[PDB]
Structures are given as C-alpha cells and as structure tokens.
Amino acid sequence: LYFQGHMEGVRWAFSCGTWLPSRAEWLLAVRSIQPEEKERIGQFVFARDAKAAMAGRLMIRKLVAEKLNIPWNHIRLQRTAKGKPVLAKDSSNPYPNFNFNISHQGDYAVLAAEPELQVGIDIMKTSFPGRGSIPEFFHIMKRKFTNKEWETIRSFKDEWTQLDMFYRNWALKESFIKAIGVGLGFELQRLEFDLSPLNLDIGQVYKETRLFLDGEEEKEWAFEESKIDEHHFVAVALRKQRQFTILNFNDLMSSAVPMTPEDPSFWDCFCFTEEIPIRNGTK
Ligand SMILES: [Br-]
Ligand SMILES: [Br-]
Ligand SMILES: [Br-]
Ligand SMILES: [Br-]
Ligand SMILES: [Br-]
Ligand SMILES: [Br-]
Ligand SMILES: [Br-]
Ligand SMILES: [Br-]
Ligand SMILES: [Br-]
C-alpha cells in the first residue's frame, strides 16, 4: 500500500557483562535516556547492574526509533504502576498491539518485541548455588514446580544438567508471568511446562515446549527457547525468524541523541565486583 517497511518480531541481546565503555561513552548513554530513568540507574550499587539497566533502556529506544520511526528525542516511555516499561499511547504508532519486554541476568540483557502478539521474555544464567547444595536449592525451590516438572528435572544423572534444566523451567515460567503482567503473587505451581526437546544446541531456537495452566493446555501460547551461550538460557512467551541478534554499544547508539547535559556525578559512583570477594550470593 505505502512505500514502507513493516515491523516483524525482534529478538535482541547485548552482553553488558563484557561491555567496558569509556567514561565518555557511559556518560553519553546516560544523557541519551529519559531523566527519571537516569535517576533509576543512579540508584544501583554495582556497575554491572547499572550497565544492565542502561542496556535495556537503549535497546527499547533503539527498537522504537528504528521500528516505529519515532525520533529518539520524541520517544516517550512510561512505566505501569507495577513498574513495567511501556510506550505512551499518544501514538505516532500504526501498531495498536505493539509491545515489548526485556530481561537481564548474568552477562546479558535481552529484548523481545512484536507488532501484534503479546510477548514476555526472561533470561537466566545457570550457576552453582551461593549457599548450600543443589539438592538443598531444589528443596528451597520445591513449591514452584510440579511433580512432573521435577521428575523431568531430576531425570538426568548429573546434578549440573538438572540445575540447567531447572533454570530453563524457571525461565519459562517467568516469561509467561512477564507476558501477562501478574508479577509477584502468582503461584508458580499453577504453571506446568512440558519441555521439548530435552537438550538444546547453543544459538538455535526451539518452539516445541508447551504450557499447561491449572491443568489445561494453553494452546494459544507458544514458547521460544534459546541458549544464547553455554550458561544463559532465554525463554520468550507469545500469545496470539527467531534467533537472537547480539548487539554492541554502537548498535545501541545508532539512533541515539543526548537529551540531558553531561552529568559527571554518574562517574565513579558505582562499586565493581573486582574489589570484593564473590561469596554467599554473587556478592
Ligand atoms: Br531486527
Ligand atoms: Br529511557
Ligand atoms: Br519491559
Ligand atoms: Br529480568
Ligand atoms: Br516485565
Ligand atoms: Br533468524
Ligand atoms: Br559493546
Ligand atoms: Br543536552
Ligand atoms: Br560490577
């Protein structure tokens, strides 16, 4: 009809864990986001958490700028009372059902967006418990997975593969929870995932896992599963192609423009994990 591209699904990842901006680059990223968002970033204690939060902010603005063609300096993002980032309804937007979601853990921040399908995303890093054993960890987490889920988790011989499968199952549940907006009080026991296939190759995307909610198959929901590296798993939930693209900082800054003057108090104000011994959690 018009001489115009059409938005498709977006699947982006950014390794904030390996991102080492110069001072100028960090302070420019800080200028390029909304003031109240910069304020949130300033609240973080550790550099790695600020970096991850920043990444998510830049990916969203990049998404909106480049896929909805809203000038960067005109993008108006907001948060639900529950805290979820959303695009202002006052549009410049031909996609009513446009939506996005973001997540971060370990070394990665990730974004999923869709023109029409409702979307949720969660990423998790497999790592050995900060305190206690793996069986002790499964016991703490026991109430959140069903009998069939646990049998599948424990079906493997080594506890690492079990821990890996556990994190996968947990990322699936969070992807759904984040898609529907229910948050913290939602009983995970109500979600039962049938994980297929049992083993995932790094980089590839799988779409065979099914969800049963309150004992009935949710046929209107699909789930895309990707191991982005050997230790990070991403689940994207979708209600009615898909490989993640890893971006760098230049990519995040492609449509960026400063919105606030440079603020040097956003330098030297964060802790770094190199100055502490990593213990009991990851801190
Ligand atoms: Br893209
Ligand atoms: Br922002
Ligand atoms: Br979000
Ligand atoms: Br998250
Ligand atoms: Br969310
Ligand atoms: Br692809
Ligand atoms: Br980078
Ligand atoms: Br300015
Ligand atoms: Br850090």
From Swiss-Prot:
It catalyses: apo-[ACP] + CoA = holo-[ACP] + adenosine 3',5'-bisphosphate + H(+); apo-[ACP] + acetyl-CoA = acetyl-[ACP] + adenosine 3',5'-bisphosphate + H(+). Mg(2+) binds at residues 122, 174. Its main location: cytoplasm. CoA binds at residues 40, 79-84, 101-104, 174-178. The keyword Metal-binding applies. Binds 1 Mg(2+) ion. It is found in: Cytoplasm, Cytosol. Changing residue 174 to A: Reduces affinity for magnesium by 40-fold, and holo-[acyl-carrier-protein] synthase activity by 32000-fold. Changing residue 105 to E: Reduces affinity for magnesium by 200-fold and abolishes holo-[acyl-carrier-protein] synthase activity. Keywords: Cytoplasm, Magnesium, Metal-binding, Phosphoprotein, Transferase. It is an enzyme of class 2 (transferase). Detected in heart, skeletal muscle, placenta, testis, brain, pancreas, liver and kidney. GO terms for biological process: 10-formyltetrahydrofolate catabolic process; lysine biosynthetic process via aminoadipic acid; pantothenate metabolic process; protein maturation. The keyword tRNA-binding does not apply. Its cofactor is Mg(2+). Signal peptide: none annotated. Changing residue 178 to A: Reduces holo-[acyl-carrier-protein] synthase activity by 2000-fold, with only minor change in the affinity for magnesium and coenzyme A. Its EC number is 2.7.8.7. Monomer. Catalyzes the post-translational modification of target proteins by phosphopantetheine. Can transfer the 4'-phosphopantetheine moiety from coenzyme A, regardless of whether the CoA is presented in the free thiol form or as an acetyl thioester, to a serine residue of a broad range of acceptors including the acyl carrier domain of FASN. PANTHER family: L-AMINOADIPATE-SEMIALDEHYDE DEHYDROGENASE-PHOSPHOPANTETHEINYL TRANSFERASE, PHOSPHOPANTETHEINE TRANSFERASE. This is L-aminoadipate-semialdehyde dehydrogenase-phosphopantetheinyl transferase. The lineage of its organism: Eukaryota, Metazoa, Chordata, Craniata, Vertebrata.
